[PDB]
Write a protein that binds this ligand. Structure first.
Ligand SMILES: Nc1ncnc2c1ncn2[C@@H]1O[C@H](COP(=O)(O)OP(=O)(O)O)[C@@H](O)[C@H]1O
Ligand SMILES: [Ca+2]
Ligand SMILES: [Ca+2]
Ligand SMILES: [Ca+2]
Ligand code: NA
Lengths: 140, 355
């Protein structure tokens, strides 16, 4: 299990999306785009496409220490997202969890049933029609 | 450079390319000729099952299956494709080493990885935490996973699945006078099982309903034109999943193995496991099995417990689909054993990279 953590941590080092994540208090958002973790522009934070899957990293100060950093990682599943986007968001959530040493707590958010912890990240939350096309190749 | 995903099932091999939404090759795990070519010349050789109850037993027949997958089904050169394989939960360390040994020395794959089947189904359902009910052809499993890591000590195993359900339907179909004996007729029983069987919400009330009227009777036309009528056998067959005593097995039903598997976990995560019962395998495809599982688990869990049964429409290939998704991620393939690392360390390296 200690060798398992070593290879899982080394694997998380090869994702450029985590470089610089969780460095300061805030909310960082990525969207799964054809099996790839793409950062969402700051101007689009809070707007989620109903057909896509996202990763939302909430860096905050825990009640036990105001000068330290805690993490709440949420992956948000749109009502029309495909199997590839939801599955990649789930795996990459665990990957970001390992990248930050297991400290983040994982939350699964689905459209319309988001937890209060996730809704509190926005003053705010707007659902948009559409979404990026699936990365799956359809087998006839 | 496309990655290969091969799901080695007890009854069916699911194989294809990473990035596809469905396996391109599905054939029985039978050796004789392999698969569809062996079921034709069946009156010449003997047909053995290399993967009984999920564990590979005979490696020479497994090598023939993998050879059939690469060259005859998918028509690919194994030397030019990183290959992701699947294994049953609680797979021994030796059986994992032999998989790596055959992949590198016999087929010369550039990279290889063996993944847990139930974990792939959970990822295919868009989840990192939950308990998977994987009921295939040879074995049924209850595998809890928390935040992407399986809990091996709570895993439940039940050597009762679709193959035994096919035979039990064959048995009870004789009560009406029908006779399914030959290997070709056993495929007709499997077709009847997959088309007309369903799980009763209340078994005893459906038994009384089948004896009260003929509203539950269904007709089925055989290939030779004979039309048969089936009654309570529709729900008596999959009932074995909840009452293994129907075939003389002194074991708990799938609802109890799920409940027990949850109780072997920390109390903090049981609340999440009850709300994330993910069904996998072709034997979980019976209509009404989710409502019945919902009813049985509710009767066992505290009254305030929120319980949810997830039945993906394509859960027949959810193991392979999850493998296709994970094999499409470069960071996941980074953990795979390359041929150079195998030539240096040997076959024991599967326990040092594959989890
Ligand atoms: N619609 C269905 N209804 C009932 N049983 C089914 C259905 N589809 C497939 N099965 C059964 O599921 C089994 C195959 O499931 P699978 O997950 O491929 O098993 P394995 O992974 O062990 O090969 C077969 O025994 C088949 O009879
Ligand atoms: Ca999409
Ligand atoms: Ca964590
Ligand atoms: Ca299987
Ligand atoms: Na086939």
């Amino acid at each position: 299990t200690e060798l398992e953590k070593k290879v899982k941590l080394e694997a998380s080092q090869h994702e450029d999306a985590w470089k610089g994540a969780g460095k300061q208090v805030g909310v960082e958002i990525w969207r799964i785009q054809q099996f790839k973790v793409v950062p969402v522009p700051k101007k689009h934070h809070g707007s989620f496409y109903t057909g896509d899957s996202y990763i939302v990293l909430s860096t905050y100060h825990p009640k036990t220490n105001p000068d330290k950093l805690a993490y709440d990682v949420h992956f948000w599943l749109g009502a029309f997202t495909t199997q590839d986007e939801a599955g990649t968001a789930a795996y990459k959530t665990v990957e970001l969890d390992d990248y930050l040493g297991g400290l983040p707590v994982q939350y699964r958010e689905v459209q319309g049933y988001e937890s209060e912890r996730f809704l509190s990240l926005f003053p705010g939350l707007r659902i948009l029609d559409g979404g990026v096309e699936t990365g799956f190749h359809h087998v006839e | 450079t496309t990655a290969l995903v091969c799901d080695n099932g007890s009854g069916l091999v699911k194989a294809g390319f990473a990035g596809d939404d469905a396996p391109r090759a599905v054939f029985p795990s039978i050796v004789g000729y392999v698969g569809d070519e062996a079921q034709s010349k069946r009156g010449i050789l003997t047909l053995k099952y290399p993967i009984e109850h999920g564990i590979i037993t005979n490696w020479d027949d497994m090598e023939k299956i993998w050879h059939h997958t690469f060259y005859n089904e998918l028509r690919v050169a194994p030397e030019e494709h990183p290959t992701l394989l699947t294994e049953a939960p609680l797979n021994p360390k030796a059986n994992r080493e032999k998989m790596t040994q055959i992949m590198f020395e016999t087929f010369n794959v550039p990279a290889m990885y063996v993944a847990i089947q139930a974990v792939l189904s959970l990822y295919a359902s868009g989840r990192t935490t939950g308990i998977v009910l994987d009921s295939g052809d040879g074995v049924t499993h209850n595998v809890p996973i928390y935040e992407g890591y399986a809990l091996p000590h709570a895993i439940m195993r039940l050597d009762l699945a679709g193959r035994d359900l096919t035979d039990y339907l064959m048995k009870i179909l004789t009560e009406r006078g029908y006779s399914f004996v030959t290997t070709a007729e056993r495929e007709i029983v499997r077709d009847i099982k997959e088309k007309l069987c369903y799980v009763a919400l209340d078994f005893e009330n459906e038994m009384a309903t089948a004896a009260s009227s003929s509203s539950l009777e269904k007709s089925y036309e055989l290939p030779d034109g004979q039309v048969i009528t089936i009654g309570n056998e529709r729900f008596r067959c999959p009932e074995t999943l909840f009452q293994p005593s129907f075939i003389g097995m002194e074991s708990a039903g799938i609802h109890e193995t799920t409940y027990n598997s949850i109780m072997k976990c920390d109390i903090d995560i049981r609340k999440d496991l009850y709300a994330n019962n993910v069904m996998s395998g072709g034997t979980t495809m019976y209509p009404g099995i989710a409502d019945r599982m919902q009813k049985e688990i509710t009767a066992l869990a505290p009254s305030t417990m929120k319980i949810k049964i997830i039945a993906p429409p394509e859960r027949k290939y959810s193991v392979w689909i999850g493998g296709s998704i994970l094999a499409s991620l470069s960071t996941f393939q980074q953990m795979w054993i390359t041929k150079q690392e195998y030539d240096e360390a040997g076959p024991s390296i599967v326990h040092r990279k594959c989890f």
